[PDB]
Design a protein around this ligand. Structure first.
Ligand SMILES: C[As](C)(=O)[O-]
Ligand SMILES: C[As](C)(=O)[O-]
Ligand SMILES: [Br-]
Ligand SMILES: [Br-]
Ligand SMILES: [Br-]
Ligand SMILES: [Br-]
Ligand SMILES: [Br-]
Ligand SMILES: [Br-]
Ligand SMILES: [Br-]
Ligand SMILES: [Br-]
Ligand SMILES: [Fe+3]
Ligand SMILES: [Fe+3]
Ligand SMILES: [Mn+2]
Ligand SMILES: [Mn+2]
Lengths: 230, 230
């Protein structure tokens, strides 16, 4: 059975200035390059840079872009709590610096990938602004031919650890009312630094662990398969 | 947030006669015992013994029962392709030897756990007999207060590897027609020897990797969370 789409789900790389998460990610990219995988997209669900440093984004971009271009894969970057919106826009995206949420829509043929920004500047918990929910609702009003993958950092999933509660995504009910009954087929997330899956308003949520392995995502006609790659 | 139920999902232990999967499982049980976890049930989703040997089941029973009794957890054993129904019944369950499918229902308070046998004696692929589907349909006609966890070996999930196709669960459509619209909240499976999750007729399927880590399952009021424990 050939899947309709193949996605690489990587998260929590936590790169720093430079003096380690650098080598851990290099080895991963090298492994996946030698596996012969040819993904349609590579989605990085947040905490890309450990302290949101400019030097870390330039480093990340230099490691990842040759990898993605060789595979012909689309790159999909997501904000995490440790990232800085302005520095990410400047040094990773080549866009004008802004503190506005990093929200974006990306079509892979018939597959829609929506990037949402659950980060809260200067803070570690997650939250989604009313403006973002309106944006998302408007976007989801039109269905994609192959449905939608939602990509964000803070997963809408109960915190199974005490430590995780204080940095969880807040006000999940509101995101739930927007997502319910839409063509969202899967939610890709990070933040937890261990592999987890659950549903949120009937939609499967898959959290990839930290790089500092990853997940393979096979999109089939009637299901989405997530495989944990150690 | 306290979950309603906590389950331990272990799979593919592959114990042999004795001359290694023995030590790998011992270390796991020891770890989980020192973590302070207190699960309601411990579900083993098949391939318990590598060659279905009597000596392997006695060995498994001797390692696991003291572990389960100390935790006050219910033990839930499932048939895999490498197991032998008769030897498992004799040496693990203290039941009269039979080659009939190992199908069973188990209530944990309001939570129903259904064990299904996807094994095919002498073969490695999975299949479910018409008699079993009738049985299952009849059982699922009455809802459980907290819904149902279905536990089986061969997952109803597309095979993302060529090697896996020839030993996959066959005739999934028929299982699907029975499960659709029931109170089945999650399907626990093994067989793949790596962590995987997907849905099957809208129901989340979680495959635990092989012991030869495991999964923690938190059952919440509105969701089931699966965490991969390396
Ligand atoms: C779990 As964290 C402090 O890397 O967002
Ligand atoms: C994947 As197998 C041969 O242990 O059923
Ligand atoms: Br700015
Ligand atoms: Br904001
Ligand atoms: Br956009
Ligand atoms: Br499918
Ligand atoms: Br017999
Ligand atoms: Br049979
Ligand atoms: Br029964
Ligand atoms: Br819940
Ligand atoms: Fe992180
Ligand atoms: Fe096995
Ligand atoms: Mn985070
Ligand atoms: Mn098996």
């Amino acid at each position: 059975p050939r899947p309709d789409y193949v996605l690489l789900h990587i998260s929590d790389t936590h790169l720093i200035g430079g003096d380690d998460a650098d080598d851990r990610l290099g080895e991963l990219l090298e492994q996946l390059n030698q596996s012969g995988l040819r993904p349609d997209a590579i989605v990085f669900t947040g905490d890309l840079a450990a302290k949101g440093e400019p030097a870390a984004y330039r480093k990340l971009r230099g490691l990842v872009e040759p990898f993605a271009a060789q595979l012909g894969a689309e790159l999909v970057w997501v904000m995490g709590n440790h990232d800085d919106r302005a520095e990410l826009r400047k040094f990773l995206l080549d866009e004008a610096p802004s503190m506005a949420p990093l929200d974006r829509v990306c079509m892979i043929d018939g597959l829609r990938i929506i990037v949402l920004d659950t980060s809260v500047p200067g803070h570690h918990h997650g939250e989604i602004r009313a403006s973002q929910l309106g944006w998302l609702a408007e976007e989801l009003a039109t269905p994609a031919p192959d449905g939608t993958i939602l990509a964000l950092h803070h997963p809408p999933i109960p915190s199974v650890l005490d430590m995780a509660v204080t940095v969880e995504l807040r006000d999940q009910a509101a995101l739930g009312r927007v997502l319910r009954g839409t063509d969202v087929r899967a939610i890709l997330a990070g933040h937890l630094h261990y592999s987890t899956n659950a549903t949120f308003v009937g939609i499967p949520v898959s959290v990839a662990s930290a790089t500092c392995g990853c997940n393979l995502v096979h999109v089939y006609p009637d299901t989405v398969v997530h495989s944990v790659i150690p």
